Amino acid sequence: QREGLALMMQLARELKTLARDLGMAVVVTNHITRDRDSGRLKPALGRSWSFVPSTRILLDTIEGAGASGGRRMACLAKSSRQPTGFQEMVDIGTW
DNA sequence: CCCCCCCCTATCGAATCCGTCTAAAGTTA
């Protein structure tokens, strides 16, 4: 089908125009998928949605030692003002 | 041309000896 992709593009356009033409701060959350041929982590909703946002934040859980709790991984996957690929450690149980 | 997942199985293979105790009964000038 095609109507779902068109609806997704229309929603993306509405969000972008609400953010820019009005001067607002919009934050959205998305799921994460595992690629089949390469086996690398990849954002969901496909390539068409891949171009929508401007700043990307990826959250992962630290396996093995330090697992569970708030201890997790925060990374920057896309930005228009910073180089990507950087690493950072954050917690979600100290606030 | 577009976007997301699946699943346990099956037994094997014997070794290694030790440590002594308890005496009894006279006979024939």
CSV table of C-alpha atoms (C1' of nucleotides) in Angstrom, one decimal, chain A residues 2 36 44-47, chain B residues 1-6:
chain,number,residue,atom,x,y,z
A,2,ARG,CA,0.9,3.7,-0.3
A,36,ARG,CA,19.0,-8.4,8.8
A,44,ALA,CA,12.4,2.1,12.6
A,45,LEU,CA,9.9,3.6,10.1
A,46,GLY,CA,12.3,3.3,7.2
A,47,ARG,CA,14.5,5.5,5.0
B,1,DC,C1',9.1,0.5,-5.5
B,2,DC,C1',7.7,0.5,0.0
B,3,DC,C1',8.4,-2.7,5.8
B,4,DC,C1',9.2,-6.3,9.5
B,5,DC,C1',10.5,-12.3,12.0
B,6,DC,C1',12.7,-18.7,14.4
